[PDB]
Amino acid sequence: CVSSGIVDACSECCEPDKCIIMLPTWPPRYVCSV
């Protein structure tokens, strides 16, 4: 699982129905904090 860091998905991350959109780093990438 990908609790924290970058994610190219949402259903694969440890975030159930609560994912963030592309914002961090120079290129567009999602974020997980759970």
Residue ranges per structural domain of the chain: 1-34
From CA 28, how far away is CA 34, in angstroms rounded?
20
Nearest-angstrom CA–CA distance, 31 and 15: 10
Structure tokens at 1: 């699982």
Distance CA 18, CA 25 (A): 20
Structure tokens at 14: 């440890």
CB neighbour list of residue 16: distance below 8 Å, 6 or more residues apart:
none
Q: For residue 34, what are its two tokens?
A: 């759970």
Residue 29 host element (H or E)? none
Contact 8, 1 (CB under 8 A): no
C-alpha 21/C-alpha 16 separation (Å) is 14
Question: Per the structure block, which two tokens stand in for 16?
Answer: 């159930």
Cβ contact 23:31 at 8 Å? yes
